[PDB]
Amino acid sequence: MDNRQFLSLTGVSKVQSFDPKEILLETIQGVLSIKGEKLGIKHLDLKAGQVEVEGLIDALVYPLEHHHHHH
Amino acid sequence: MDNRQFLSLTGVSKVQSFDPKEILLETIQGVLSIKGEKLGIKHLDLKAGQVEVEGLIDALVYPLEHHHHHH
């Protein structure tokens, strides 16, 4: 069991921020905030529109539903 | 068009709860809460410490530990 995780996600259309400690990827229905450290490796070309990163990802944050909730 | 995104994570030591709308994985920094629609696993997952899920994800919940981070 290693501490580095390899994260692969599809639906990535627009890159709004890329830092090895915080990455903002604009995906199909939301923007993903990838927080951690040593988040190396990036898809420079959106071949299948997917991202594949390696490092110590501490938190994965997707946007909460636009208010709504039904509650 | 399909709106399903493929989310793959390595370093998954244990699974907490498995529901096709909400996946709970016990990993390095804590429990990763995957929320969405049709959250099915790609194959024989959990094995090898890797989990691939496909579906129309709504949001991701990953706690910044209780280990600082919050600033």
From TrEMBL, chains A, B:
It comes from the Bacteria. Signal peptide: none annotated. GO terms for biological process: sporulation resulting in formation of a cellular spore. This is Sporulation protein YabP. It comes from Desulfitobacterium hafniense (strain Y51). The chain holds residues 21 to 82 of 97 of the full protein.
